[PDB]
Amino acid sequence: PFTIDTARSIFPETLAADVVPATIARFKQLSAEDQLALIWFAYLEMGKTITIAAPGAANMQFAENTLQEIRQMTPLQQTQAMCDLANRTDTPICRTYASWSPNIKLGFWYELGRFMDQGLVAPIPEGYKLSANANAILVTIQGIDPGQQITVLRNCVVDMGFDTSKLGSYQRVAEPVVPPQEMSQRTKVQIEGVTNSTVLQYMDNLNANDFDNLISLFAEDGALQPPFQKPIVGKENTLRFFREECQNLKLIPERGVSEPTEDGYTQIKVTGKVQTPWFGGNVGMNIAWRFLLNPENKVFFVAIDLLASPKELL
Amino acid sequence: PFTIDTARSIFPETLAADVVPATIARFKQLSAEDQLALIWFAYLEMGKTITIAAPGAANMQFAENTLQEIRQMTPLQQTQAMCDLANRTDTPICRTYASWSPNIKLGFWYELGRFMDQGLVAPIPEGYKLSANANAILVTIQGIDPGQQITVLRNCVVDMGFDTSKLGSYQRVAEPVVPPQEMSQRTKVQIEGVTNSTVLQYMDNLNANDFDNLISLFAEDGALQPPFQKPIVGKENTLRFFREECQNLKLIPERGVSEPTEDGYTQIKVTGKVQTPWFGGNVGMNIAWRFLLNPENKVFFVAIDLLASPKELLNL
Numbered sequence: 254p255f256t257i258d259t260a261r262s263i264f265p266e267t268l269a270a271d272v273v274p275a276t277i278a279r280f281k282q283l284s285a286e287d288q289l290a291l292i293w294f295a296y297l298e299m300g301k302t303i304t305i306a307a308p309g310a311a312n313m314q315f316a317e318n319t320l321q322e323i324r325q326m327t328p329l330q331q332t333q334a335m336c337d338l339a340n341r342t343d344t345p346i347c348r349t350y351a352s353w354s355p356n357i358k359l360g361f362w363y364e365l366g367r368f369m370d371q372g373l374v375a376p377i378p379e380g381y382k383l384s385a386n387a388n389a390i391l392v393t394i395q396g397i398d399p400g401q402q403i404t405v406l407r408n409c410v411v412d413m414g415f416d417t418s419k420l421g422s423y424q425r426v427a428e429p430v431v432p433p434q435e436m437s438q439r440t441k442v443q444i445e446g447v448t449n450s451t452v453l454q455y456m457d458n459l460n461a462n463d464f465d466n467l468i469s470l471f472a473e474d475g476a477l478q479p480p481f482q483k484p485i486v487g488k489e490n491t492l493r494f495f496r497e498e499c500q501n502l503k504l505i506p507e508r509g510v511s512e513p514t515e516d517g518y519t520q521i522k523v524t525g526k527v528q529t530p531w532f533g534g535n536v537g538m539n540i541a542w543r544f545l546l547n548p549e550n551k552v553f554f555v556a557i558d559l560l561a562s563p564k565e566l567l
Numbered sequence: 568p569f570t571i572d573t574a575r576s577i578f579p580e581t582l583a584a585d586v587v588p589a590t591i592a593r594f595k596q597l598s599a600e601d602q603l604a605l606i607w608f609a610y611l612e613m614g615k616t617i618t619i620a621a622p623g624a625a626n627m628q629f630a631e632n633t634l635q636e637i638r639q640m641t642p643l644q645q646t647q648a649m650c651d652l653a654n655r656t657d658t659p660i661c662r663t664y665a666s667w668s669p670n671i672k673l674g675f676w677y678e679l680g681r682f683m684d685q686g687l688v689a690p691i692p693e694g695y696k697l698s699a700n701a702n703a704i705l706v707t708i709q710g711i712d713p714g715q716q717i718t719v720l721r722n723c724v725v726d727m728g729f730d731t732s733k734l735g736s737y738q739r740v741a742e743p744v745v746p747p748q749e750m751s752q753r754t755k756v757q758i759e760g761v762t763n764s765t766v767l768q769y770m771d772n773l774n775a776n777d778f779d780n781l782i783s784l785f786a787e788d789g790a791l792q793p794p795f796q797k798p799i800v801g802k803e804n805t806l807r808f809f810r811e812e813c814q815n816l817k818l819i820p821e822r823g824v825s826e827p828t829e830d831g832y833t834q835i836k837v838t839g840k841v842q843t844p845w846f847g848g849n850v851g852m853n854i855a856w857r858f859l860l861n862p863e864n865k866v867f868f869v870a871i872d873l874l875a876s877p878k879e880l881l882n883l
């Protein structure tokens with residue numbers, strides 16, 4: 254009855270924060286130097302009210318060799334290396350960066366920012382003026398909510414380095430998988446209007462980093478759609494995504510609606526807050542989960558949407 | 568002194584219509600059925616104000632075989648075929664579509680629209696309910712200028728069919744290159760504040776479809792950046808782009824500023840109107856040309872920008 258494409262259309266009144274890919278698209282039109290300066294100014298302004306959690310040694314170890322190379326470079330080489338990352342050009346550093354998971358890339362840029370503040374790495378020239386288009390993009394970023402602001406920043410960091418297509422040699426570099434939280438120390442979510450055990454186990458397993466028990470809730474046909482990404486189809490691909498990108502998330506669902514669909518299927522929409530380990534309690538992202546469960550109550554499809562405003566929570 | 572990347576930053580106060588790639592990015596997030604219905608509704612209201620020029624036989628011949636296949640299909644097959652096009656899925660029709668130039672693809676969709684109106688091809692339902700996000704995107708499109716509206720529509724059409732980005736080599740079907748109009752009968756542009764012959768020959772050669780004389784004005788290192796696209800580097804690549812995508816354009820430049828730069832280079836900004844053969848006089852796109860000429864006055868880089876508003880025409 255249902256396909257992955259048909260399932261994408263569930264709960265069509267859910268207004269996603271499409272200002273995020275819109276702003277990214279606007280950002281992509283700018284020159285490399287403008288792109289680098291805009292992020293510098295957006296990050297600096299963000300830091301005045303939003304505090305970032307410094308990355309641990311386990312994250313820093315992977316980007317250590319690349320950072321030490323940039324640290325031993327000349328100011329023109331350091332600048333060119335950063336321009337190459339933003340331009341997506343073919344360089345050994347860009348190829349090394351390309352192989353990293355989002356968290357390694359984020360941790361790498363956090364360290365470079367600290368180096369730029371300390372004068373260890375060439376800074377954004379004091380006499381730098383953003384283009385008319387870059388200035389308007391910066392105004393847009395300052396006008397959107399913190400959850401949308403950090404998503405814009407993350408997507409820009411991820412989109413850098415040599416194009417992953419046509420690798421030649423690529424060991425996907427990701428952080429080690431932290432053992433799942435002790436069952437005795439686990440918390441259980443409560444969702445007003447939702448008592449479906451698959452949905453509840455989904456939230457609880459992810460909050461405990463229990464990816465092996467989390468993947469069991471998915472059908473063989475199953476798929477997961479992260480915000481503004483295409484659906485990730487199959488248990489193997491979904492599990493890899495969990496292990497590489499979904500460690501230490503805090504899902505705080507509040508309320509939801511469970512509705513019967515055609516041919517024994519179940520449509521469940523949940524809204525709540527999500528905390529990223531990069532900011533913790535400092536940023537509460539407005540999230541909606543759109544579940545399409547098969548007649549066996551297994552996850553055939555789950556869409557995770559970044560919401561336009563807190564109004565979308567109800 | 569200058570590189571292609573450095574040249575992209577010339578005249579940084581030029582405010583481009585980035586609402587176009589922003590709206591495209593928003594559009595790309597929608598489902599295939601929503602994407603197709605949104606274009607149907609955007610095109611229908613646009614048709615009431617902005618009249619499209621029907622494609623000639625020379626354009627229609629390339630999409631004829633594909634259109635006849637869809638014409639002989641069932642309503643569910645016809646719908647699936649159009650859904651596949653929007654979804655960028657791997658099917659023979661999507662692979663055929665991917666080989667086509669923007670004009671063939673546009674002409675193909677124009678014919679399908681006529682078939683949908685005539686009931687020959689499965690139409691968009693009664694009062695199709697667009698998603699909350701699709702409705703807001705449609706409002707955005709209705710709120711932007713005609714030049715920005717048609718650019719959004721064209722870019723969506725171009726992005727359909729099989730994705731050939733992961734392919735090192737792909738077949739390319741394009742309209743025949745019509746030989747340029749005779750030199751004596753040609754029109755000559757006049758730009759208030761710009762008398763540089765390379766800039767003037769650029770406008771005049773393109774208005775006459777004289778791509779061979781147009782490419783001669785470009786340096787071997789030369790590049791051309793179309794609106795919201797990456798720069799096309801080299802004479803071979805730039806000439807192919809002219810021959811496949813730049814036939815029958817009408818450039819109406821109005822005014823500009825010529826400024827000397829570092830190491831004998833010249834920075835020239837021109838603003839004016841551009842007419843596409845798809846709409847003719849019905850749509851006047853607000854355009855800026857950002858030229859970076861080498862000390863030999865050859866085009867090292869030229870950026871063509873779709874402007875945010877007609878106010879940007881006076882911004883020099």
Ligand SMILES: CC1=C(/C=C/C(C)=C/C=C/C(C)=C/C=C/C=C(C)/C=C/C=C(C)/C=C/C2=C(C)C(=O)CCC2(C)C)C(C)(C)C[C@H](O)C1
Pocket residue numbers: 288289290292293296305359362363365366369403404406407410459478479480498499502504527529531538540557
């Ligand atoms: C790039 C750059 C610079 C560096 C900037 C930096 C350090 C930026 C860092 C930004 C950060 C840390 C952003 C973090 C964002 C995290 C986000 C948006 C987390 C999102 C996760 C979510 C919504 C989880 C979603 C999920 C749930 C809830 C599920 O149910 C299943 C999985 C899934 C992942 C979809 C500087 C140095 C400043 C200037 C230079 O010129 C350029």
Ligand SMILES: CC1=C(/C=C/C(C)=C/C=C/C(C)=C/C=C/C=C(C)/C=C/C=C(C)/C=C/C2=C(C)C(=O)CCC2(C)C)C(C)(C)C[C@H](O)C1
Pocket residue numbers: 602603604606607610611619673676677679680683717718720721724773792793794812813816818841843845852854871
């Ligand atoms: C796709 C679709 C449908 C079809 C709709 C149709 C037929 C849409 C077609 C729209 C058209 C014809 C759009 C064309 C726009 C043309 C434009 C934007 C041309 C722009 C050209 C410019 C700006 C030229 C610039 C240049 C200049 C000035 C230079 O100096 C150098 C060359 C260069 C090209 C860069 C329907 C059937 C309605 C519904 C279905 O569900 C889906």
Ligand SMILES: OC[C@H]1O[C@@](CO)(O[C@H]2O[C@H](CO)[C@@H](O)[C@H](O)[C@H]2O)[C@@H](O)[C@@H]1O
Pocket residue numbers: 620621622623624626670671674742814815844845
């Ligand atoms: O020429 C580009 C493009 O313009 C279209 C738009 O309909 O055709 C116009 O120009 C043709 C000459 O090139 C005329 O034969 C035609 O009548 C006119 O509409 C497309 O067909 C073509 O791809």
Ligand SMILES: [Cl-]
Pocket residue numbers: 498502529530531
């Ligand atoms: Cl995260």
Ligand SMILES: [Cl-]
Pocket residue numbers: 812816843844845
């Ligand atoms: Cl055109």
